[PDB]
Structure 1
């Protein structure tokens, strides 16, 4: 799993983008997983208008047309492009 919990939002998101791109290239040129599991934590709200990691990640995934589902609370399975 890519563990993003507890990070500043902009650094969590940078890692997410970087890693989704790496994993997608690995998926296409090699074998392996068609998904990436991501640990976000369970926090649901922004705080002072600033996304907690879960909303930041999920907003990003929805906005960028990613299919995803929950493996267990705080952990998502994200389908690669």
Structure 2
């Protein structure tokens, strides 16, 4: 319905290289949570690794790595869509 605070909350990984996608997931995990605490947004973050591609080849192999990195940092996430991943941003201190 109504609209909320500005700023992208969904990060699209599909299209980039496993290496890139990963690094991005980390840079966005901290860069995103920033505004989340500064302003105030959803405690989670949308991340699209890729969908449909598999049909032909979908050899992206991005989700595989992402999932591995997540579990490592004990990052809680749920699968609501066959092409989306909901992750719960971890809370903590602030820049200042």
Instruction: Decide: shared fold, TM above 0.5.
Output: yes
Distance in 1 of aligned mates of 2:51 and 2:58 = 17
Distance in 1 of aligned mates of 2:71 and 2:53 = 15
Compared CA separation, residues 46 and 25, structure 1 to 2 (3 A):
farther
Ranges in structure 2 where 5+ consecutive residues have no aligned partner: 1-10, 91-96
TM-score of the two chains, using structure 1 as the length reference: 0.82
Between structures 1 and 2, the one with greater strand share = 1
> Which moves more between the two structures, 34-43 or 58-67?
34-43
Aligned length: 80
TM-score of the two chains, using structure 2 as the length reference: 0.70
Distance in 1 of aligned mates of 2:57 and 2:82 = 23
Ranges in structure 1 where 5+ consecutive residues have no aligned partner: none
